[PDB]
Amino acid sequence: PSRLYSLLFRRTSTFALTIAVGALFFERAFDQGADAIYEHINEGKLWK
Amino acid sequence: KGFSYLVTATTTVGVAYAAKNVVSQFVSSMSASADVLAMSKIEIKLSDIPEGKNM
Amino acid sequence: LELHPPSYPWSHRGLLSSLDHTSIRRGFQVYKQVCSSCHSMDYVAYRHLVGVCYTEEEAKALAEEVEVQDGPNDDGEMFMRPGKLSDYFPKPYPNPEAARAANNGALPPDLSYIVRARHGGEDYVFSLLTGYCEPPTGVSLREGLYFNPYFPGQAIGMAPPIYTEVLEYDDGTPATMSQVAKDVATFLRWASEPEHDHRKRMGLKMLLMMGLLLPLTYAMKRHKWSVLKSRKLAYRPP
Amino acid sequence: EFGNLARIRHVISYSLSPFEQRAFPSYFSKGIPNVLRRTRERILRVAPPFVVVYLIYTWGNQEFEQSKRKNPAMYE
Amino acid sequence: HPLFKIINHSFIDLPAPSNISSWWNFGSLLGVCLMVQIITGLFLAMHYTSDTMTAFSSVTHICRDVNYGWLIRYMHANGASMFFICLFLHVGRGLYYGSYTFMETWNIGVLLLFAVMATAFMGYVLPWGQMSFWGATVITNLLSAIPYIGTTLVEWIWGGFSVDKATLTRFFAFHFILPFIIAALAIVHLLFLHETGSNNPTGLNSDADKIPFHPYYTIKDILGILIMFLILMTLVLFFPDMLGDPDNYMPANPLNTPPHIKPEWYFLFAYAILRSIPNKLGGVLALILSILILALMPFLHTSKQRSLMFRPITQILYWILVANLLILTWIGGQPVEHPFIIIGQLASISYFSIILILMPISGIIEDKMLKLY
Amino acid sequence: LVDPLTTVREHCEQLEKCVKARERLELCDNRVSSRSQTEEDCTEELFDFLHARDHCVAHKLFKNLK
Ligand code: HEC
Ligand code: HEM
Ligand code: HEM
């Protein structure tokens, strides 16, 4: 979308800003997601 | 341009995620390990210390 | 020339298959009641269990179960304290010689890294503990020996320690010799690598991150390299 | 450095901007044919040494086993 | 700016050939591996203790209680293995494409190879397992070959009658200090090369087609770094003990000796050669030559074409050389008994005859086929 | 208490391939015993039988066990 480029990518700093924010949130999702996936993968064999 | 710049931002975030983690792990390594982490234990005996003596 | 233990479908074998952590619990019970009389898990301390198959307070219980005397005393040359969480597992036969003395001069190797130290350990362990078969014709083991087709030389000083129903699992799972050998092989495995589970989670996150990042970095490389890969050269002598 | 590397003459060189060209044009379209083209031109030079390494490795293993095999006449 | 002058020129605008394949990534990977090893080595050095009293335990503590300490230790071990994989492929690229005609770069390279092998040997001695102690004794005694100078020299390194704490501590010091000398020698390696520029797989003068390095061979090196990191981690996090040895997880017993002793994979080709020669001294020498034959390589080039892209007979001889290098790697593993020995003896004879005799004769024949000779 | 292993070893031996092997070994056993002045032992013979039996057990033991 042009909006993205026009607003988020056009300014190099914003390009970084978006990356920064994204990084701040990516961890949360990826961690939790992978954790659960892992949890499901080894659904029964764990400490619980 | 957007699509291309999109790819890079994405790649950037990826490297960042892993970067933060590995570094954290290493810094975590230097951090006191469990070996010394466990030190809560303490043993005391009141009779040994008479009034006016520090131990 | 040695029998090569077969591949068993160990649960933890799976790329992302973590250690049961339920079985281990059973396995340790096996080490505590049978294997701890001769072997020493020197590098595994009660605290280590917390988080794997025993909870903090729960571990505290086990720690206290045994007694540990430390020499430093104000006037005494020792003081006996029930084991604390930090205390490491109690090794019998303090000096190896003690062990040799009673073990026919055969040192029970610490089973802390036995699985890691023995080629195909998990299998070997299971096989050895369950390989106590009949000696063949012509064999003449020396005094105080037994016959196991796997052990190097097939002459292990260790007598067969797992007789069916040797110990009772607190969980109640039938204590058949095998169920006991599989549990102690899982436990010894855990011992030789307490991080097995944590790692595999790191490996799963690594595979997901590389599956995200490799085509994107390849796309960036092919962007920057497209320019040249489309360059058309023409020779135009005047 | 650049500018003093070499002397060429009358060699025109056209090119396009990255964002003006698709990322993997005809990638699998011609990539496969090319990769296959490539493998043909090099397989006869590369593969038969590793084939006879595989035969020597197997042979060694089996021969070694037979070597370890007990002579029937042994101790009889 | 003085520094930026050095930087941009060396790392950004270095006129590089446009057609170099992925094999040219490998040397940069080696540099990254060096840094990785150094970094992981530094984080092993904050908890390791050279005392033979606490070595085994120090390491155990490293893989048991040190936070993520198992991760850093197995990254260090598998990064040494990845270093030798990238080193062997770098040397194979140099042999195949005729890059040994850069003679000073090649000689600084073979010095770097000797230093890396010594560093990895003493590093493998460092955890003080069963396998480390018997391995150290064994090729240290190898040094005992020299008749007048050898014996004393051995105990000199052993710092005593037999390897014992005296060795461990000095091996820790030397294993610590040599990768920085390797980094300085790598800087000299890069200098002796920029004077001449890199080679291309066609072996021709690439001065007509050179491109910058920043946007073309940097993102390529980044992609190669990412792929090498994928292979290392998947060789640490999933198959962590694949390349190691199980008997190194036992403590060092001088009274017992591991029944089946073998060098790590990378040092085997040499091991085979050593075992092959009946004479002890002969073995040591041949062993050395095994590595040194490479240095000797730029004086054996008798062809009018630099690379092997247009040379099929020498391509066949090169792949036969790679084949019996793999054979020598396998033999080293095999124990001493028929027929592993004969293969070892032949494989060594074929290795030295292909490098010394067969390739220059083949290059002469190839020059004769093109009506050049 | 029937150890699954016990049962598995039964089925596995029942495998014909394995059956043939055992026979060979027994021949060796008696041959060895019958031979008076000798040192050859059936260990190697024993070894071979086991490999097979074990492999078979490997295929069916883990699951049987709980
Ligand atoms: C009451 C005595 C005793 C019990 C119970 C016992 N062991 Fe042992 N074990 C020994 C002795 C003695 C040795 C030394 C034998 C030798 O070195 O030849 C030994 C040696 C070993 C070895 C070394 C084999 C090798 O490869 O060198 C392993 C593995 C082993 N035991 C496993 C176990 C396991 C697994 C259990 C239970 C799940 C167990 N032991 C229970 C006495 C015992
Ligand atoms: C200056 C940087 C380095 C430092 C500080 C360092 C430090 C250490 C330490 C303390 C150990 C003992 C850990 C252990 O083995 O349990 C070790 C082991 C080792 N190091 Fe290094 N090292 C460095 C560079 C290297 C390099 C460049 C290589 C490769 C050539 C290397 C290869 C090894 C190997 C193979 C081991 C043994 C791994 C094993 O236990 O099996 N190290 N290093
Ligand atoms: C770990 C040690 C080494 C490192 C870090 C290293 C690093 C490098 C680097 C960064 C380059 C630049 C070109 C490239 O990477 O493709 C290079 C070039 C080269 N290296 Fe190495 N090298 C090492 C060992 C060796 C050895 C042992 C040899 C000899 C067998 C060697 C032979 C060469 C040659 C011939 C070139 C020029 C190839 C070309 O650019 O066309 N190097 N090295």
DSSP E95-118: HHTTGGGSHHHHHHHHHHHHHHHH
Please name which ligand lies nearest the alpha carbon of E30.
3
**Cα E12 to the center of its chain, rounded Å:** 28
Bridge partners for E23 per DSSP: none
Q: Is the CB of C53 under 6 A from ligand 1?
A: no
User: Cα–Cα distance between E341 and D58 in angstroms, integer?
Assistant: 15
User: Cα–Cα distance between A4 and A10 in angstroms, integer?
Assistant: 8
B-chain CB neighbours of C85 within 8 Å are 38
Residue C22, CB half-sphere, CA atoms under 13 Å: how many?
11
User: Cα–Cα distance between A34 and D25 in angstroms, integer?
Assistant: 34
A24: helix, strand or coil: helix
CB D15 within 8 A of CB C221: no
CA dihedral in degrees (C184, C188, C189, C193; nearest 10)?
150
* Ligand 2 pocket residues where CB is under 6 Å: E 34, 37-38, 41-42, 44-45, 48, 59, 73, 76-77, 80, 83, 116, 119-120, 123-124, 126-127, 175-176, 179, 244
Q: What is the maximum span of chain C, computed from C-alpha positions, in angstroms?
A: 106
CB E261 within 8 A of CB E135: yes
- From residue C221, alpha-carbon distances to D58, E13, E35 in Å are 42, 18, 24
User: Cα–Cα distance between A32 and C213 in angstroms, integer?
Assistant: 19
Q: Is the CB of E266 under 6 A from ligand 3?
A: no
CA proximity to C47, closest of C88, C92, C82 = C88
Indicate which residue's Cα is closest to atom 43 of ligand 3: E27
Residue D27 burial (C-beta neighbours within 10 Å; 0-12, 13-18, 19+)? exposed
Bridge partners for D12 per DSSP: C234
List Cβ<8 Å contacts ≥24 apart for C155-159.
C156/C106, C156/C128, C157/C103, C157/C104, C157/C105, C157/C106, C158/C38, C158/C103, C158/C106, C158/C108
User: Cα–Cα distance between A11 and E61 in angstroms, integer?
Assistant: 50
What single letter denotes the amino acid at residue E358? Answer: L
Residue with tokens 């130290």: C117
List binding-site positions of E: 76, 90, 175, 189, 194
CB C190 within 8 A of CB C19: yes
- Whether the link from the prior residue into D48 is cis, omega within 30° of 0, is no
Q: What's the C108 CA to ligand 1 centre distance in angstroms?
A: 5
CA proximity to C213, closest of C223, C224, C205 = C205
Q: In the numeric block, which tokens belong to residue C34?
A: 């049978």
User: Cα–Cα distance between E46 and E43 in angstroms, integer?
Assistant: 6
**Could A9 and B17 be called an inter-chain contact, meaning their C-beta atoms sit closer than 8 Å?**
no
User: Cα–Cα distance between C201 and A33 in angstroms, integer?
Assistant: 12
CB E208 within 8 A of CB D6: yes
| Backbone angle region of E67, left / alpha / beta, with phi > 0 → left and psi within -120 to 50 → alpha | beta
CB F3 within 8 A of CB F64: no
Q: Provide the experimental method for this PDB entry.
A: cryo-EM
Kindly write down the DSSP assignment for every residue of D17-49, as one continuous string. Answer: -GGGS-SSTTHHHHHHHHHHHHHHHHHHHHHHH
CA proximity to E24, closest of E216, E206, E198, E228 = E198
**Cα C108 to the center of its chain, rounded Å:** 16
- The string over E2-23, giving b where at least 16 C-beta atoms fall within 10 Å of a residue's C-beta and e elsewhere, is eeeeeeeeeeeebbbbbebeee
Tell whether E281 lies on the interface with C, counting CB pairs under 8 A.
no
- The string over C202-216, giving b where at least 16 C-beta atoms fall within 10 Å of a residue's C-beta and e elsewhere, is bbbbbbebbebbbeb
| Beta strand pairing call for C79-82 and C67-70 | antiparallel
Residues 6+ apart with CB under 8 A from A9: A15, A18, B1, B2, B5, B6, B9
Element (DSSP H or E) covering residue C232: strand C232-235
User: Cα–Cα distance between E229 and E221 in angstroms, integer?
Assistant: 12
Q: What are phi and psi of E266, to 5 degrees?
A: -60, -30
- Search chain B and give the residue with CA nearest A16: B9
CA proximity to A4, closest of E280, C201, B3 = B3
D-chain CB neighbours of C238 within 8 Å are 10
**Could C217 and B11 be called an inter-chain contact, meaning their C-beta atoms sit closer than 8 Å?**
yes
What single letter denotes the amino acid at residue E154? Answer: V
Q: What is the maximum span of chain F, computed from C-alpha positions, in angstroms?
A: 48
In angstroms, what separates the C-alpha of B14 from chain A's closest C-alpha?
8
- Search chain D and give the residue with CA nearest E213: D2
Mutate to test the pocket of ligand 2, among E76, E78, E84, E182 (most ligand atoms within 8 A of CB): E76
CA proximity to C90, closest of C67, C115, C114, C70 = C67
Kindly write down the DSSP assignment for every residue of C144-194, as one continuous string. Answer: S-B--SSSGGG-BSS-----TTSS--TT-----HHHHHHHHHHHHHHHH-T
| Beta strand pairing call for E16-17 and D11-14 | unpaired
Kindly write down the DSSP assignment for every residue of C68-133, as one continuous string. Answer: EEES--SSSS-EEEEPPTTSBPPPSSSSHHHHHHHTTT-----SSSHHHHSTTHHHHHHHHHT---
Residues 6+ apart with CB under 8 A from C182: C23, C126, F62, F65
**Could C226 and D21 be called an inter-chain contact, meaning their C-beta atoms sit closer than 8 Å?**
yes
Other CB atoms within a 10 A radius of the CB of residue E349 amount to 12
User: Cα–Cα distance between E28 and E36 in angstroms, integer?
Assistant: 12
Output the CA torsion sign for E131, E124, B32, C201: negative
Residue with tokens 């690594």: C206
CB C102 within 8 A of CB C110: no
User: Cα–Cα distance between C178 and C184 in angstroms, integer?
Assistant: 10
In chain B, where does DSSP find H-type helix? 2-30, 34-37
CA proximity to E245, closest of C87, C167, C116 = C116
User: Does C39 appear as a known binding residue?
Assistant: yes
CB F50 within 8 A of CB F22: no
Kindly write down the DSSP assignment for every residue of E249-294, as one continuous string. Answer: GSB--SSS--SS----GGGHHHHHHHHHSSSHHHHHHHHHHHHHHH
CB E163 within 8 A of CB E136: yes
Residue D37 burial (C-beta neighbours within 10 Å; 0-12, 13-18, 19+)? exposed
CB E233 within 8 A of CB C203: yes
Other CB atoms within a 10 A radius of the CB of residue E177 amount to 10
- The string over E297-328, giving b where at least 16 C-beta atoms fall within 10 Å of a residue's C-beta and e elsewhere, is bbeeeebebbbbbebebbbbbbbbbbbbbbbb
CA proximity to C208, closest of E225, A21, A30 = A30
Q: What is the maximum span of chain A, computed from C-alpha positions, in angstroms?
A: 50
- From residue F20, alpha-carbon distances to C136, F23, F30, F31, F59 in Å are 18, 5, 16, 17, 19
